[PDB]
Amino acid sequence: TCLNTLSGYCDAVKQSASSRRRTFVVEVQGGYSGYLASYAGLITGALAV
Amino acid sequence: SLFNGTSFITLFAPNSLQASIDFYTNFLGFAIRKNSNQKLQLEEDQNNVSIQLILDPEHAASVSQIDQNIRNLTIQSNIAFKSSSLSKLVKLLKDGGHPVQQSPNEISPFEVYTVDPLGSLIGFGFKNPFAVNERVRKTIGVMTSGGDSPGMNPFVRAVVRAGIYKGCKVFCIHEGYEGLVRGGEKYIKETQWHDVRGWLVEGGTNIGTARCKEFRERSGRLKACKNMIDMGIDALIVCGGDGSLTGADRFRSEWPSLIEEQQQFNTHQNLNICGAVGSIDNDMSSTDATIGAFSSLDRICRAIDYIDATASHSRAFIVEVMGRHCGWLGLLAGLATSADYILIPEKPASSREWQDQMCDIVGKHRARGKRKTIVIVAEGAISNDLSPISCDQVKDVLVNRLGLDTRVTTLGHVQRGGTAVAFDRIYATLQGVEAVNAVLECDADTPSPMIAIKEDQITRVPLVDAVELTQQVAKSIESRNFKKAISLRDSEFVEHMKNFISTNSDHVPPSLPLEKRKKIAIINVGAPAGGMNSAVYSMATYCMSRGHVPYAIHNGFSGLARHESVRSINWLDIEGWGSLGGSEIGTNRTLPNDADIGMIAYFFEKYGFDGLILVGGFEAFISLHQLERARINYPSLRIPLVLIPATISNNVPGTEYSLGSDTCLNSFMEYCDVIKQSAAATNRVFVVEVQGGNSGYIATHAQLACGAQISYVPEEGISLAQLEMDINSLKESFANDQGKTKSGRLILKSENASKVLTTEVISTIIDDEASGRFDSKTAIPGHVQQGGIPSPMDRVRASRFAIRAVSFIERHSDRCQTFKNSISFRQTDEITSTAVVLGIHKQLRFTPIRQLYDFESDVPRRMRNIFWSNVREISDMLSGRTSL
Amino acid sequence: SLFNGTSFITLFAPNSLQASIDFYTNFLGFAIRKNSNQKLQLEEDQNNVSIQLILDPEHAASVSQIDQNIRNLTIQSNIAFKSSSLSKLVKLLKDGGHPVQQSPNEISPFEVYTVDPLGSLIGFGFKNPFAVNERVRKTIGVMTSGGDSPGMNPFVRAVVRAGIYKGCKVFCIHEGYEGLVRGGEKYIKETQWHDVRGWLVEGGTNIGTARCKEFRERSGRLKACKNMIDMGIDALIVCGGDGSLTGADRFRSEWPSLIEEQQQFNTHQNLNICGAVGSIDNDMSSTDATIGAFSSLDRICRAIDYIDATASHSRAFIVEVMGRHCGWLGLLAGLATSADYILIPEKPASSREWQDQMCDIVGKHRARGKRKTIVIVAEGAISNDLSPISCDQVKDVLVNRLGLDTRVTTLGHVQRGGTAVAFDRIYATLQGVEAVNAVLECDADTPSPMIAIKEDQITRVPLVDAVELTQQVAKSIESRNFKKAISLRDSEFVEHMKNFISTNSDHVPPSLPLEKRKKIAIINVGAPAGGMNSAVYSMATYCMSRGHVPYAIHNGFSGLARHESVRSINWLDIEGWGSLGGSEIGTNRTLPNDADIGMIAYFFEKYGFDGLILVGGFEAFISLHQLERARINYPSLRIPLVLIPATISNNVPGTEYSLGSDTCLNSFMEYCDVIKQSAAATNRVFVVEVQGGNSGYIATHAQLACGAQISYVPEEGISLAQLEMDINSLKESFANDQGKTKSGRLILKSENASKVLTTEVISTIIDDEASGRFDSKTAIPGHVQQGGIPSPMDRVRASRFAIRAVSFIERHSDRCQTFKNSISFRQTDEITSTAVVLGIHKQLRFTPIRQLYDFESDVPRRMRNIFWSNVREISDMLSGRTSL
Ligand SMILES: Nc1ncnc2c1ncn2[C@@H]1O[C@H](COP(=O)(O)OP(=O)(O)OP(=O)(O)O)[C@@H](O)[C@H]1O
Ligand SMILES: Nc1ncnc2c1ncn2[C@@H]1O[C@H](COP(=O)(O)OP(=O)(O)OP(=O)(O)O)[C@@H](O)[C@H]1O
Structure with a gap:
C-alpha cells in the first residue's frame, strides 16, 4: 500500500517539477532499513537514493 | 526675514458671496466671526487660519463663471492648505459635486474650486511621507430521500451541528418518508453533536432512504403529520431528489389536516419545511448544482481517464452513464473528457437518424486522426420519437456500421459511492447550515424554501417554483421540444451545450465570414494550475470552429522576447490536452517588463495578433497591467487583453474562482x-x-x-x-x-x-x-x-472561460483597431476597457485591469x-x- | 513588405576618402574588396555588411569640417550597427582620439564620427538585455636586539616559516649580538616550522636580546663575522631598535674583514643584511610605525582610560610614559585620551617656562569646566636648555603652584609586556615575510634594506639613509632646533602635533578672520563604528579652534527630515567623547531619499550649512551620492560634502582603512x-x-x-x-x-x-x-x-581625518557659493569634485563620489x-x- 502511495505521490511530484521547481x-x-527507499527508488526512476 | 508669516487670504465677491460662505464652512470647517461690521472666516481656536470676504465689485460674475468652466479640462495662481488625511476631503468634495486634482489618488496634494477658484490642499513643506491623520427555539427533523448521492452525510452533519449551535433539538428521520410515516423512536432518533463525527468522509446516507408507498397517498401523508406532532418536531428538512421534494411540496399544501379525532393543533399549526437537492442527476431547475452531481461527474471522468490512458485502430469505447432525467452528467463528462459523441435526452438527433449523426461525427474524428473513439450513453438516452436508445443499440452501430471493436464500460452504483468531492463537501455543509437558518427564520407568510447554488453562491428559492420548473422541462422533452427543454435548463447548461458542440466541431467550415476572422494568441504566466491546458485546448478548438488562427506563446514572456516562441496550434497535436495537468505550452513567473516589453510588442505586430488570452496567476495579473500601460508606446498592444485566473492559491482579484x-x-x-x-x-x-x-x-x-x-x-x-x-x-x-x-x-x-x-x-x-x-x-x-489530472470542474470551467475570452476579443477588436492604426493615442477610457480580467462575482463579468490593480490588490510583495x-x-x- | 532588407550604405567623399578608408578598417573591422574598378568596404564572409565609398564631388570639405566641430557639444540623421560588447569598441575609439556618446557607460548604444559623421552602434531591435559577447638558496639568521617590544615573536615566527617555505635553513640567534659574537650551537640554533607555534600570542622575545659590549668594538665585530661563516649563515636579519640597527649598519660597512689568520672567503664574501624596527619608541625615521609602537601606545591608553573612568575638584593625574628618544607615544596617547598637557622632547616650552606654560593650559581647562586633569610625562621629557624634567618636578608644580592633589601612574615594563595588538601582529608578520624576500632578492649592487611601513603599506628603504636620518633628528634636538626636529619626523608626526595643539586649544581666540569662518555640520550614517565619536570630538574642537560653528545632526537623515535634529556642539558636553564607543550623535541606516531629501535640503538652507561631514559606512557612501545627485534640485546642497568611512567591515570604496x-x-x-x-x-x-x-x-x-x-x-x-x-x-x-x-x-x-x-x-x-x-x-x-572603547589607532586616525575633512570644506566653500547663489545650475565638473570620499590609497586622498559609485562599487545588494x-x-x- 505504501509503495503504491509513494509512486503515485512522486508522479505528482515530477509533474509539478515540469517557474516553480526542478529537483x-x-x-x-x-x-532504519533501506528497503522502502530502495524499492521506491526503482519504481519512481529516482536519480539518487 | 521680512515676510515673517501668512496672516490671511483676502477674497473679493461680485455685488450675492453667500455661495462661497456656505462652501468654505460646510466643506472646509470654517466659521463666520461674531457681529459682522457689513451685513471674517476663521477655522478654530489656538490656530492662525483666516479667509477675508468682501462684497465690493472688484471681481466680475462673467469673468469668474468663464474661469470655472475653463478649469474643466483634466493654469492659475492658487493657495495651498496644510491638512491631514486628504482622502476623506476628496470623497466629501467629489460626492458634494466638486471636481478635484490629485497625485496618485492615494493621495498627496488635493485641489478644488469655489466662486474663488483653485483652493489647493497639501498633506505636509517639501516631499516626504505626509502629516499623520488626526483623532428561533423549534426542534428540527432531518431526512434523506431517493438514491444515494455523495454529500448527503456532510449535509446531515451540518444540519445536526447548526441546529444544536442555534439551540434546538435535532432528530434524524431514518429511512426517509418510510420512517416519517411509521414514526416512533425506531425511526425518529434524537441526534447529538458527536454522533455525526467524521461523516464528511462517509459515503451514501448514514440515516438511510426508503421509498414510501403510503406517503404517495393521503393515507400516509396524514400518519406522517401525526408522527411529527407526537415527536414534537416543529420543522422538517428534506435532502433528496425531484419527486422526493415534490412529495414534500404536496405535503406542505396538504398540511392543513386539522382532523378532529386543541393544544397540539394550536402549537403545531404550521409546517416549517426546507428542501435541499440530494441528487447526482442535476435535474432540479432552480439550482446550478445539486448535492452529489460533481462527485458523480468525477466517478465518470475517472473511468474515461483510465480508458484514454492506453494505445490502436478499430477501437471504440462506450461509457454507460447513470442519470435518468437530465443530460448534465453526459454533457459535462463529454466536455471534460473531449468525447466524440454523446447521447443525452435534451439533444437527440433531429435532421437525420442518430446512427447517421453518430457515424458522421465519429467518422470525421477518426478520419482527421483521433484513434480512441469515446461515446457516452446517458440513462435517459433517447431518440426524437422518445424511443430509448440502449448501449447494445449503440454498440451494434459501432461494430456493424463501422469496423470498430467496441468495449462497454458501465459505472452503475460506482456513480453514487465514495466520499463527496471537495465541492460537494463544502457546498453540502453550507447548505445544511442555511437549511437550519431558513427553517428558523421562517414565518407563515414566507413561502417554503429550497436551498440552491447560483454561480458559486448559496441562495433561497421557493420550492413550489423549483418543482414547477423541473416539470416544465420534463413536459418539453415529452412534448418533443428539445430546443425549448435546453433553454429551460440553467444558463450554465445552455452555455456548456454550445461550448461542447463548437469545440467538438476544425472538421466543418468556419462559423464566421472571412472578414470577421482574427489571429488570437494564448500564454501561460505563473506556476502551473489545473485547467491551463484545458483553457488552451478549448480556446484553440473554439478558434478553429469560428475560423480564427489560434497561436500559442510557449514559455511565457521570456520565451517570446528572448526566443520568438509563437507557435501554431494543430488539432491532432492538442489531443487529450483538456485532461492533462500542468502547462503544455510552458509557464513561468517572468513579467513582460522582466522580459523585453519592446520585443513582446515587436512579435505582436510581426504576427499581427488581434487579441491575447493570459491563463495564469498573479504574475499574469501584473502582466496584463504592464501590457496595458505600455499601449502608449506600442500600437501593437492596443488589442483586447483577457486574463483567465489560474492559481491553486486564488490570490488574483477579479474572480472568486481561479482555475x-x-x-x-x-x-x-x-x-x-x-x-x-x-x-x-x-x-x-x-x-x-x-x-x-x-x-x-x-x-x-x-x-x-x-x-x-x-x-x-x-x-x-x-x-x-x-x-x-x-x-x-x-x-x-x-x-x-x-x-x-x-x-x-x-x-x-x-x-x-x-x-x-x-x-x-x-x-x-x-x-x-x-x-x-x-x-x-x-x-x-x-x-x-x-x-x-485536473478536476472535471476545472476542465469544464476552463472551457467556459476560454470561450468567453475569445468572444470578448471578437466584440472589442473593431474598437481597438482605431487606436492601433493611429498615433496621437492619449490612452482613453474606450481603450482601457479592453485590458480586462474574466471573473466570477456573486455573475460572470470582465473587470478592467485598472480598477483591480489600483484599488483591489496588494500589488506589492504580498500579491493578494x-x-x-x-x-x-x-x-x-x-x-x-x-x-x- | 517592400523594403525587404538593407543592402549597403553609400558615402560620397570630397575629390582625398583615404582617412575614412583607414578609420572603418582599423576601428570597425572592414576590408577593401579585391581589384578596385576605380583607383567597396565589406566586413566578413557569410554576412551582409557593406559600405560604398565614392570620390565624386558630392560632399564639400568646408561643410563636413563645420559639421564635425558642430557635433562637439555634449542632432543629425545616422546609421546604427548591430555589435556585441560595445564596451571594447568605446575604449578603442576614445583612446584612438574619437569622441563617443553612450547610455549608462555600462553601456547600451555607442555613437562616434568620421569624415562621414554619426556612425551609431546598438547592442541588440527593442529594449531587453543585449546580444551576447562573441568568442635564492642561502641559510638565514634571525636575531632580536634592544628592549622587549610586542610583536617580536610574530616577526620571528614569520621569518622562520617564510625562509623555510622559500627552501632555506633558518637559525635563531639567541641573545642577539651576544649570541652572534659568542657563537656556537649554544646561541645559534636551527629552527623548525613547528618550533615557532603559537608565537603570535607570546609576549617579548622567545629568542632573547642582550647588550653586547664586545660588538661595540672591532674586537667583537670580527668574532661575530667568523661565527656566521662557521655556522654557514649567508644572510642576517636584525629586528631591533635605532642603535641596534646602526650597529648592524656599521657591521655592514666593516664586513670586508678578509683577515688572513680561500674556499670560505670566496663563498661568504658579501653580507646579506636586512633590518626591521623592533621598538615601542617609534623613533626610527624612514618608517611610519615601528614594531611594538601601537601595543605600547595601547598599554598607555588602557591606563589613562581607567584613570578617566571615575569622578572631583583639586585632582590632577600624571602618566609617566616610557620612550626615551621620541615623543610619538606621548603625543598619540595625549591625542587618543585628550590630555590637558604633554611633556615631550620635540615640543618643549619656548617663549615661557614649562611650568608657566603647563599651568596656563591646565588652568584654562579647569576654568572652562574640565575636572580631571591628565598630564603625560615622556621618558625624554625635557626643557629648552635640554634639562630633563622629572615626574616629581611636574608633581610639585601641580601640588604647589595649583591646589591639586596629584597621583602619579607609571607604566614601566607594562609598556613592553603583553601580546602584540592586531596591527603589530599583522604588520610584524608581513615584515618578517618581506625581510626574507629582501634578503634572498639581495645582490652586491643593492644597498642593505630596512623594512618600513609607509601609510599602511610595506616598503623597502635603505638602512644607511634611515640610520642617517634618525641621527639628524637627534642632532636637531641636541642643537636645540625643536621646530626643525618636528619637521624631520614623519609627515604623520607633524600632522598629529598640529592636530593635538589645535584640538587642545575653544579657549583661545579663533585662528581664522571673521569672513573666513563657516557653519560645518556632521552626521553619523550606518551601524556604529569605533572612532565615530572621535571624528565628532576632533571636528568640533578643530572648528572652535578655527572659529567655525560645529553642528551635529542627531540620528542620521531620519532625525533631520522627520525631527529637525540640528544641534550645537558644546566643548564641555563632548568631554571624553574621543574615548567613547558607538555614536553619541546617533546613527542609523536611513538614506537621504528614504528620509525626505527636500526636508534635508530645507534644513541645510534654514541653518545655512557651509559644508557636511558624513562619518559612516556604505549607507553614508550611498548618502553622499544621493545628496550629490539632488544638487540640481536644491542649491542648499551645493556645498562640500565629505565622507570619512566608518565600518567594522571595510566595505566602503575610496579608503583602504575604515574607522x-x-x-x-x-x-x-x-x-x-x-x-x-x-x-x-x-x-x-x-x-x-x-x-x-x-x-x-x-x-x-x-x-x-x-x-x-x-x-x-x-x-x-x-x-x-x-x-x-x-x-x-x-x-x-x-x-x-x-x-x-x-x-x-x-x-x-x-x-x-x-x-x-x-x-x-x-x-x-x-x-x-x-x-x-x-x-x-x-x-x-x-x-x-x-x-x-575604540582602539588608540581609531581615536587617532579619526582625529586626523576629521581635520582633513574640515580643511577640505574650508578650501572648496568659496567655489561652491557660485553654484549655491545661482539657478541655471547645469551640474558641472567644478561642483561634482566637492562631493568627495576621504581615503587611504598606498597617500591620503579625496576621491569624487561619482568615480567610486559608478565604477568602484557593487552599488547593489552586495554593498562592496x-x-x-x-x-x-x-x-x-x-x-x-x-x-x-
Ligand atoms: N451528440 C453530439 N455529440 C458530439 N458532437 C455533436 C453532437 N451533436 C452535434 N455535434 C457536433 O455538431 C456538429 C454538427 O452536428 P449536426 O451536423 O448533426 O447538426 P445538428 O444541428 O447538431 O443536428 P440536428 O439538426 O440533427 O439536431 C457535429 O459534427 C459535431 O461535431
Ligand atoms: N605641551 C603642550 N601640551 C598640550 N597643549 C599644548 C602644549 N604646548 C602648547 N599647547 C597648546 O597650544 C596652545 C597655545 O600654546 P602657547 O600659548 O604655549 O603657544 P606655543 O607656540 O605652543 O608655545 P611656545 O612658543 O612656548 O612653544 C595652548 O594653550 C595649548 O592648546
Whole structure:
C-alpha cells in the first residue's frame, strides 16, 4: 500500500517539477532499513537514493 | 526675514458671496466671526487660519463663471492648505459635486474650486511621507430521500451541528418518508453533536432512504403529520431528489389536516419545511448544482481517464452513464473528457437518424486522426420519437456500421459511492447550515424554501417554483421540444451545450465570414494550475470552429522576447490536452517588463495578433497591467487583453474562482483525510502545512471539507494567546473523547501564517504543553499540491472561460483597431476597457485591469480583501473553535 | 513588405576618402574588396555588411569640417550597427582620439564620427538585455636586539616559516649580538616550522636580546663575522631598535674583514643584511610605525582610560610614559585620551617656562569646566636648555603652584609586556615575510634594506639613509632646533602635533578672520563604528579652534527630515567623547531619499550649512551620492560634502582603512585567542563565525593575526571540494601533532561565505568526516564584534581625518557659493569634485563620489574589488593551506 502511495505521490511530484521547481528530495519514512527507499527508488526512476 | 508669516487670504465677491460662505464652512470647517461690521472666516481656536470676504465689485460674475468652466479640462495662481488625511476631503468634495486634482489618488496634494477658484490642499513643506491623520427555539427533523448521492452525510452533519449551535433539538428521520410515516423512536432518533463525527468522509446516507408507498397517498401523508406532532418536531428538512421534494411540496399544501379525532393543533399549526437537492442527476431547475452531481461527474471522468490512458485502430469505447432525467452528467463528462459523441435526452438527433449523426461525427474524428473513439450513453438516452436508445443499440452501430471493436464500460452504483468531492463537501455543509437558518427564520407568510447554488453562491428559492420548473422541462422533452427543454435548463447548461458542440466541431467550415476572422494568441504566466491546458485546448478548438488562427506563446514572456516562441496550434497535436495537468505550452513567473516589453510588442505586430488570452496567476495579473500601460508606446498592444485566473492559491482579484483551485483543494482534501484517519488510529494531533502563499483560501476550504479543528491563515497570523487558547482546546477535546467516536484531529497551518511559529515549531509547543496526555506530529506534503489530472470542474470551467475570452476579443477588436492604426493615442477610457480580467462575482463579468490593480490588490510583495470570511466562521462553529 | 532588407550604405567623399578608408578598417573591422574598378568596404564572409565609398564631388570639405566641430557639444540623421560588447569598441575609439556618446557607460548604444559623421552602434531591435559577447638558496639568521617590544615573536615566527617555505635553513640567534659574537650551537640554533607555534600570542622575545659590549668594538665585530661563516649563515636579519640597527649598519660597512689568520672567503664574501624596527619608541625615521609602537601606545591608553573612568575638584593625574628618544607615544596617547598637557622632547616650552606654560593650559581647562586633569610625562621629557624634567618636578608644580592633589601612574615594563595588538601582529608578520624576500632578492649592487611601513603599506628603504636620518633628528634636538626636529619626523608626526595643539586649544581666540569662518555640520550614517565619536570630538574642537560653528545632526537623515535634529556642539558636553564607543550623535541606516531629501535640503538652507561631514559606512557612501545627485534640485546642497568611512567591515570604496576596523579586529583577535587556547587544552577544531558582511576583510586579517588554519570569505565562497580538501588537511594536521606544541586549531568562516554551508553545518561535517580522531565545535560571538572603547589607532586616525575633512570644506566653500547663489545650475565638473570620499590609497586622498559609485562599487545588494589578496596568500602559506 505504501509503495503504491509513494509512486503515485512522486508522479505528482515530477509533474509539478515540469517557474516553480526542478529537483525534488522526497523523504521516505521506512525506519532504519533501506528497503522502502530502495524499492521506491526503482519504481519512481529516482536519480539518487 | 521680512515676510515673517501668512496672516490671511483676502477674497473679493461680485455685488450675492453667500455661495462661497456656505462652501468654505460646510466643506472646509470654517466659521463666520461674531457681529459682522457689513451685513471674517476663521477655522478654530489656538490656530492662525483666516479667509477675508468682501462684497465690493472688484471681481466680475462673467469673468469668474468663464474661469470655472475653463478649469474643466483634466493654469492659475492658487493657495495651498496644510491638512491631514486628504482622502476623506476628496470623497466629501467629489460626492458634494466638486471636481478635484490629485497625485496618485492615494493621495498627496488635493485641489478644488469655489466662486474663488483653485483652493489647493497639501498633506505636509517639501516631499516626504505626509502629516499623520488626526483623532428561533423549534426542534428540527432531518431526512434523506431517493438514491444515494455523495454529500448527503456532510449535509446531515451540518444540519445536526447548526441546529444544536442555534439551540434546538435535532432528530434524524431514518429511512426517509418510510420512517416519517411509521414514526416512533425506531425511526425518529434524537441526534447529538458527536454522533455525526467524521461523516464528511462517509459515503451514501448514514440515516438511510426508503421509498414510501403510503406517503404517495393521503393515507400516509396524514400518519406522517401525526408522527411529527407526537415527536414534537416543529420543522422538517428534506435532502433528496425531484419527486422526493415534490412529495414534500404536496405535503406542505396538504398540511392543513386539522382532523378532529386543541393544544397540539394550536402549537403545531404550521409546517416549517426546507428542501435541499440530494441528487447526482442535476435535474432540479432552480439550482446550478445539486448535492452529489460533481462527485458523480468525477466517478465518470475517472473511468474515461483510465480508458484514454492506453494505445490502436478499430477501437471504440462506450461509457454507460447513470442519470435518468437530465443530460448534465453526459454533457459535462463529454466536455471534460473531449468525447466524440454523446447521447443525452435534451439533444437527440433531429435532421437525420442518430446512427447517421453518430457515424458522421465519429467518422470525421477518426478520419482527421483521433484513434480512441469515446461515446457516452446517458440513462435517459433517447431518440426524437422518445424511443430509448440502449448501449447494445449503440454498440451494434459501432461494430456493424463501422469496423470498430467496441468495449462497454458501465459505472452503475460506482456513480453514487465514495466520499463527496471537495465541492460537494463544502457546498453540502453550507447548505445544511442555511437549511437550519431558513427553517428558523421562517414565518407563515414566507413561502417554503429550497436551498440552491447560483454561480458559486448559496441562495433561497421557493420550492413550489423549483418543482414547477423541473416539470416544465420534463413536459418539453415529452412534448418533443428539445430546443425549448435546453433553454429551460440553467444558463450554465445552455452555455456548456454550445461550448461542447463548437469545440467538438476544425472538421466543418468556419462559423464566421472571412472578414470577421482574427489571429488570437494564448500564454501561460505563473506556476502551473489545473485547467491551463484545458483553457488552451478549448480556446484553440473554439478558434478553429469560428475560423480564427489560434497561436500559442510557449514559455511565457521570456520565451517570446528572448526566443520568438509563437507557435501554431494543430488539432491532432492538442489531443487529450483538456485532461492533462500542468502547462503544455510552458509557464513561468517572468513579467513582460522582466522580459523585453519592446520585443513582446515587436512579435505582436510581426504576427499581427488581434487579441491575447493570459491563463495564469498573479504574475499574469501584473502582466496584463504592464501590457496595458505600455499601449502608449506600442500600437501593437492596443488589442483586447483577457486574463483567465489560474492559481491553486486564488490570490488574483477579479474572480472568486481561479482555475486549479478545485484540483488542488481535492488533492489536499484527500491528503488530509488519510492524515486524520491516521490520527484516529493512534490521542494525536497533526499540524498540516498548507500551500497558497499569502492567500488563506485553500486552508479555509480544506478546514471545512476535512473537519480540521483549526486553520491558521496569513491574513490573521498566529498569536501566542490564540495558540495557547487553541492548545488548551486540544487538551479539553482529548479529555472529552472518552466515550465518543475517534475521528482524529487536524490543525491546518498555511506556511505564510507565521514565519516564527512554523508547522514544526507549533507541533513541538503542542507536545510541550500536552504533558503526555496526547502527542503532536507534523504533515508537510510540500509544493506537490498542484496535482496531475485536473478536476472535471476545472476542465469544464476552463472551457467556459476560454470561450468567453475569445468572444470578448471578437466584440472589442473593431474598437481597438482605431487606436492601433493611429498615433496621437492619449490612452482613453474606450481603450482601457479592453485590458480586462474574466471573473466570477456573486455573475460572470470582465473587470478592467485598472480598477483591480489600483484599488483591489496588494500589488506589492504580498500579491493578494478576502470573501471567504463567512466560510471561516462556519468551520470554527462546526469544530467548536473559540477565537480572540 | 517592400523594403525587404538593407543592402549597403553609400558615402560620397570630397575629390582625398583615404582617412575614412583607414578609420572603418582599423576601428570597425572592414576590408577593401579585391581589384578596385576605380583607383567597396565589406566586413566578413557569410554576412551582409557593406559600405560604398565614392570620390565624386558630392560632399564639400568646408561643410563636413563645420559639421564635425558642430557635433562637439555634449542632432543629425545616422546609421546604427548591430555589435556585441560595445564596451571594447568605446575604449578603442576614445583612446584612438574619437569622441563617443553612450547610455549608462555600462553601456547600451555607442555613437562616434568620421569624415562621414554619426556612425551609431546598438547592442541588440527593442529594449531587453543585449546580444551576447562573441568568442635564492642561502641559510638565514634571525636575531632580536634592544628592549622587549610586542610583536617580536610574530616577526620571528614569520621569518622562520617564510625562509623555510622559500627552501632555506633558518637559525635563531639567541641573545642577539651576544649570541652572534659568542657563537656556537649554544646561541645559534636551527629552527623548525613547528618550533615557532603559537608565537603570535607570546609576549617579548622567545629568542632573547642582550647588550653586547664586545660588538661595540672591532674586537667583537670580527668574532661575530667568523661565527656566521662557521655556522654557514649567508644572510642576517636584525629586528631591533635605532642603535641596534646602526650597529648592524656599521657591521655592514666593516664586513670586508678578509683577515688572513680561500674556499670560505670566496663563498661568504658579501653580507646579506636586512633590518626591521623592533621598538615601542617609534623613533626610527624612514618608517611610519615601528614594531611594538601601537601595543605600547595601547598599554598607555588602557591606563589613562581607567584613570578617566571615575569622578572631583583639586585632582590632577600624571602618566609617566616610557620612550626615551621620541615623543610619538606621548603625543598619540595625549591625542587618543585628550590630555590637558604633554611633556615631550620635540615640543618643549619656548617663549615661557614649562611650568608657566603647563599651568596656563591646565588652568584654562579647569576654568572652562574640565575636572580631571591628565598630564603625560615622556621618558625624554625635557626643557629648552635640554634639562630633563622629572615626574616629581611636574608633581610639585601641580601640588604647589595649583591646589591639586596629584597621583602619579607609571607604566614601566607594562609598556613592553603583553601580546602584540592586531596591527603589530599583522604588520610584524608581513615584515618578517618581506625581510626574507629582501634578503634572498639581495645582490652586491643593492644597498642593505630596512623594512618600513609607509601609510599602511610595506616598503623597502635603505638602512644607511634611515640610520642617517634618525641621527639628524637627534642632532636637531641636541642643537636645540625643536621646530626643525618636528619637521624631520614623519609627515604623520607633524600632522598629529598640529592636530593635538589645535584640538587642545575653544579657549583661545579663533585662528581664522571673521569672513573666513563657516557653519560645518556632521552626521553619523550606518551601524556604529569605533572612532565615530572621535571624528565628532576632533571636528568640533578643530572648528572652535578655527572659529567655525560645529553642528551635529542627531540620528542620521531620519532625525533631520522627520525631527529637525540640528544641534550645537558644546566643548564641555563632548568631554571624553574621543574615548567613547558607538555614536553619541546617533546613527542609523536611513538614506537621504528614504528620509525626505527636500526636508534635508530645507534644513541645510534654514541653518545655512557651509559644508557636511558624513562619518559612516556604505549607507553614508550611498548618502553622499544621493545628496550629490539632488544638487540640481536644491542649491542648499551645493556645498562640500565629505565622507570619512566608518565600518567594522571595510566595505566602503575610496579608503583602504575604515574607522572602527582596528577596534573590531582587535576584539575578534582577543576572542579567537581564547577559543584557540581552549582548543589547545582539549584534538579539537573551532569554526569561528566572522562579521563584516559581504566584505572578507576582517576574516582575512583575523586569520593572519590569530594563526587560523583557514578563513572562508564571501568573495571566494565555500566549495564542497575545498571543504573536503580542508577537512583532510585537519585530519593530517592532528595525525602530525604527535610530538609538536599543542597550539589549537581555528577555521574562520565569514557568515556571508555560504548560506547553505553555515558555521554549524560545516562543524557537523568535520565531526562526520573526522571519524572520532578529533572533534569540531563552533564559536558564534554575534554582532557584538563592534566593541566599546575604540582602539588608540581609531581615536587617532579619526582625529586626523576629521581635520582633513574640515580643511577640505574650508578650501572648496568659496567655489561652491557660485553654484549655491545661482539657478541655471547645469551640474558641472567644478561642483561634482566637492562631493568627495576621504581615503587611504598606498597617500591620503579625496576621491569624487561619482568615480567610486559608478565604477568602484557593487552599488547593489552586495554593498562592496579587494586589495587584501596578498595578505590572504601569506596567511595560507603560514598555515599550510592548499587551495583549488
Ligand atoms: N451528440 C453530439 N455529440 C458530439 N458532437 C455533436 C453532437 N451533436 C452535434 N455535434 C457536433 O455538431 C456538429 C454538427 O452536428 P449536426 O451536423 O448533426 O447538426 P445538428 O444541428 O447538431 O443536428 P440536428 O439538426 O440533427 O439536431 C457535429 O459534427 C459535431 O461535431
Ligand atoms: N605641551 C603642550 N601640551 C598640550 N597643549 C599644548 C602644549 N604646548 C602648547 N599647547 C597648546 O597650544 C596652545 C597655545 O600654546 P602657547 O600659548 O604655549 O603657544 P606655543 O607656540 O605652543 O608655545 P611656545 O612658543 O612656548 O612653544 C595652548 O594653550 C595649548 O592648546
